Design an enzyme around this catalytic site. Structure first.
Site, PDB file in Angstrom:
ATOM      1  N   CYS A 177      27.650  11.656 -30.581  1.00  0.00           N
ATOM      2  CA  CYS A 177      26.520  10.813 -30.198  1.00  0.00           C
ATOM      3  C   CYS A 177      25.267  11.634 -29.934  1.00  0.00           C
ATOM      4  O   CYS A 177      25.343  12.849 -29.751  1.00  0.00           O
ATOM      5  CB  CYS A 177      26.867   9.999 -28.961  1.00  0.00           C
ATOM      6  SG  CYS A 177      27.535  11.010 -27.617  1.00  0.00           S
ATOM      7  N   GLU A 200      25.055   4.053 -28.896  1.00  0.00           N
ATOM      8  CA  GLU A 200      25.119   4.074 -30.351  1.00  0.00           C
ATOM      9  C   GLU A 200      24.216   2.976 -30.887  1.00  0.00           C
ATOM     10  O   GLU A 200      23.984   1.973 -30.214  1.00  0.00           O
ATOM     11  CB  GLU A 200      26.548   3.878 -30.883  1.00  0.00           C
ATOM     12  CG  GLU A 200      27.432   5.105 -30.731  1.00  0.00           C
ATOM     13  CD  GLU A 200      28.891   4.829 -31.065  1.00  0.00           C
ATOM     14  OE1 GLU A 200      29.171   3.797 -31.706  1.00  0.00           O
ATOM     15  OE2 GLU A 200      29.764   5.646 -30.689  1.00  0.00           O
TER      16      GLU A 200
END
Length: 227
Positions: free
Chosen positions: A1, A104
């Site tokens: 991420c 996300e």
DNA sequence: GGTCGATTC
């Protein structure tokens, strides 16, 4: 991420980690307060040296002098242990980045919708990291990376990768200097928290901009057209 | 010698 939240007190994360080794981290009840942790900033990072637990602010990003591209911020678990670039970090530079959850962005056409992802049981997470020791030197170019894995089960709908999140017992094992690179790979395979242990929901699009730093950035948003 | 964050007055 490439974005996460690290908002609560040191002792909130450390109590769950439940280390038995000496802690070289003074008591600090002040919340870290970061709801939008971005690449290229210093991030508080846990590591173990001289058999003691340390918490140091480390640059999120890794760019050796010979690297002529933007700094890397993730390392793929599939290949990092044998990567010519990442192998030394996998062997000697393992670390843990604790967090409340991560963000996300789900491409929904030409429009991306941010989601906040976190443990369904309400606990914080330990993300596996690798980086350039000694961490305490405050290097501006050679910091740490978050290890990533393929998204499994529900998470692949949001996005195709995820951080390697370790259960507390595996986070402790990961940081030990005595284990080998191959042992670290076994820890990564044995302590990875499956996707069905996470909950996720859309958040305000404001988190996309790193200038925005409020606690509302992890709060969920109902997205129906008719309301 | 690699990887997936947005943003760009």
């Amino acid at each position: 991420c490439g974005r996460f939240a690290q908002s609560q007190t040191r002792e909130d994360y450390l109590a769950l980690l439940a280390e038995d080794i000496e802690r070289d981290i003074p008591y600090d009840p002040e919340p870290i307060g970061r709801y939008n942790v971005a690449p290229g900033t210093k991030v508080l990072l846990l590591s173990e040296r001289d058999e003691h637990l340390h918490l140091d602010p480390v640059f999120w990003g890794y760019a050796p002098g010979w690297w002529d591209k933007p700094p890397l911020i993730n390392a793929r678990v599939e290949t990092a242990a044998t990567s010519r670039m990442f192998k030394p970090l996998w062997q000697h530079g393992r670390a843990i980045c604790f967090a409340d959850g991560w963000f996300e962005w789900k491409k929904e056409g030409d429009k991306k919708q941010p989601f906040f992802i976190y443990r369904a049981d309400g606990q914080p997470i330990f993300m596996a990291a690798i980086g350039s020791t000694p961490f305490e030197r405050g290097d501006e170019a050679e910091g740490f990376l978050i290890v990533t894995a393929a998204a499994d089960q529900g998470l692949v709908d949001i996005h195709d990768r995820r951080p390697l999140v370790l259960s507390p017992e595996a986070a402790r094992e990961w940081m030990r200097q005595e284990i080998s690179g191959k042992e670290a790979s076994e820890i990564a395979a044995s302590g990875c928290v499956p996707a069905n242990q996470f909950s996720w929901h859309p958040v305000s699009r404001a988190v996309g901009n790193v200038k925005n730093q409020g606690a509302e950035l992890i709060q969920p948003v109902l997205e129906v057209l008719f309301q």
